[PDB]
Subunit: 252 residues, 3 copies
């Protein structure tokens, strides 16, 4: 059901803040879906995050700095004792300034035992940075393991460079046939992966040839460090000058 | 009111928190958020503060963000359940996480004078940083605190560049009269999470004037999260042999 | 320090979330995992100078997760500061998309440490591009206890805004007169950038008259600030320009 989605807590993709922790071995360190610990030693605590205050004001918040599309939240009870959360509300924030509630704060169905996971796919996927589970009803104690499942994210880095220029009365302004003027370009910083480059006109100064305009600009020899900006014309056209801006973007 | 419109980093779980030392497993940074309160009827859940284990002028709590922020303010508060608080501190920060810097060249910032009354420090100039640290310099009783950092809201963009969308040589714009269009569907390499805006501009032009007039255009139509229709066009009596464009599509948040 | 100079120390800079398989107890957790972490040697209650697992088997791990992709150059391993416990070999696993995971060297063991405090660096055969990375201890002395660091290339963060269809209007002022002539259209970005952007501003629609067979048209930003810029459309000489349209791309760094 969750194929192709990111398991946020399993991949350590969020910070976890809780309202309260029962003690130092019942914390959010123990909150991942299917977390299991040493069943022969009591000292490592609970197979769950468990609160210290038992009321309807507790919560665990997962925060991402990069916005995510949340598809599903999975809840699970406590692995080593009969404590589990039977319903909960979801709150979330995209800008980390205003918070909203899923279903206007209505309860979502939780679990009924220690280990059987209950997935909730949100009615509409939720676009958010931070998301919180607020237990509303429970068996025994407020104790849970959980996961959030998000669409995979993509990360880009873009560099813009302005005003790459042929010069006045450039080599395109004499001769005939295919002709080019090459201007090397160095990016401000080196990209981590090979960028794609858009390179488009902002200033055109050219002569038609039997009423035809023929002008072009294209990158060549694109690397992580820069590229060659190739201005060109062809046929009998005489082009005094061309200027272009570029946009270079690398992914992941 | 003073921090209205700003992001409360710790409250929003926007940073990782590393400490120099923790008194024990119930005095950790899990207890550090401003106004954190716990079970006052049970001792086992520990302090209403992060408390260090070593008491000297070398302790700290570091908040780390991967996405750069403009830090407006840091708020300090004492320990909720005992008379322990930090009376002055210094601030260090890093933008690139290689070089670190000291706010006010390491000079002291005024802290708090009681358990619960928050003292906000707005930085003399806002600090652009990824990571930021509070280094207690003086204290009452023990090095124990709750805190918050307040940043401007961040925006996140994702950009895709696509090169060389082309009409073809001697395209349909090279015949006829009036408004004429050649449509080239474009599919982005990946689907955006939200609707992008698209810039789509010329990189090669091969066209004939009409009574000395040049008339050429290119424009996206039907932009979705998956792609768009690249519409090349001319109008009036102009004949256009070919046009080429590159696009830049960016989605926010 | 010299061998990793100029690289980002992830844990030291609090750049990652840390998830462990198990923690011995609440004072043996990943809070104690940073390279060279040292604690109160006079008081036992603050625990170990290491993350120490609760289960001692080949299924333990510590995961470092970053939301922004990094180029991982090196992993440093260190033993426990306060007891004779350390990890003698381990495997490295990682993921870029946080869906599919991969094993470094097809899961072969990487050499760990031989004592409490002497750090052993492993520079990856090829730098690893990833979001999340995990240390899986394979062999150990005494217990599974470690301090560690990951070193990455510095990251750059950009924010980009695209705005479409900035227009002179039909039959604009460039369509009369002689000499250098400009039509200025102020542009406000949808949001204010945190730092000064660079701006690409390029044509998407051209409606102009040649002059003695010459085309002379231009567009350029002026007075770029964090909030916006003036879009300056222009011609010169005897050219008459009915209209010009442009799209912009503005990007701010760090
Ligand atoms: C390669 C090239 O020049 N193609 C252009 C085409 O040019 C042709 C010449 O190749 C041909 O020899 O003579 C023609 C007139 O007799 C014309 O110059 O011109 C096309 C527009 O009609 C188009 O501009 C091609 O770029
Ligand atoms: C709709 C159109 O083609 N507008 C262009 C305008 O074209 C005009 C025609 O509308 C009119 O019928 O006849 C005129 C010549 O008498 C001319 O063709 O021309 C403008 C430039 O002068 C501009 O190019 C408009 O785009
Ligand atoms: C300043 C200018 O308009 N430069 C363009 C140049 O214009 C020259 C004039 O400088 C000169 O005074 O007169 C010439 C005609 O007799 C011509 O207009 O023309 C260049 C192309 O040949 C280019 O367009 C310059 O931008
Ligand atoms: Ca420009
Ligand atoms: Ca191109
Ligand atoms: Ca456009």
């Amino acid at each position: 059901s969750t194929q192709g989605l990111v398991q946020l807590l399993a991949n350590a993709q969020c910070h976890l803040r809780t309202s309260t922790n029962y003690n130092g071995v019942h914390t959010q360190f123990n909150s991942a879906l299917n977390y299991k610990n040493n069943g022969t030693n009591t000292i490592d605590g609970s197979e769950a995050w468990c609160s210290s205050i038992v009321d309807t004001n507790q919560y665990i918040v997962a925060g991402c700095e990069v916005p995510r599309t949340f598809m599903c939240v999975a809840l699970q009870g406590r692995g080593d004792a009969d404590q589990w959360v039977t319903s909960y509300k979801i709150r979330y924030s995209l800008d980390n300034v205003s918070w909203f509630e899923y279903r206007n704060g209505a309860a979502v169905t939780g679990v009924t035992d220690r280990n059987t996971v209950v997935n909730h796919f949100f009615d509409t996927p939720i676009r958010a940075r931070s998301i919180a589970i607020h237990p509303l009803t429970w068996n025994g104690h407020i104790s849970l393991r959980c996961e959030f499942y998000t669409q995979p994210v993509q990360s880009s880095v873009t560099q813009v460079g302005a005003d790459i220029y042929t010069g006045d009365n450039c080599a395109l302004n004499t001769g005939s046939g295919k002709r080019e003027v090459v201007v090397p370009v160095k990016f401000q910083f080196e990209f981590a992966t090979l960028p794609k480059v858009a390179l488009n006109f902002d200033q055109i100064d050219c002569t038609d040839a039997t009423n035809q305009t023929r002008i072009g600009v294209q990158p060549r020899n694109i690397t992580t460090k820069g590229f060659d900006c190739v201005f060109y014309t062809w046929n009998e056209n005489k082009v005094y000058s061309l200027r272009a801006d570029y946009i270079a973007t690398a992914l992941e």
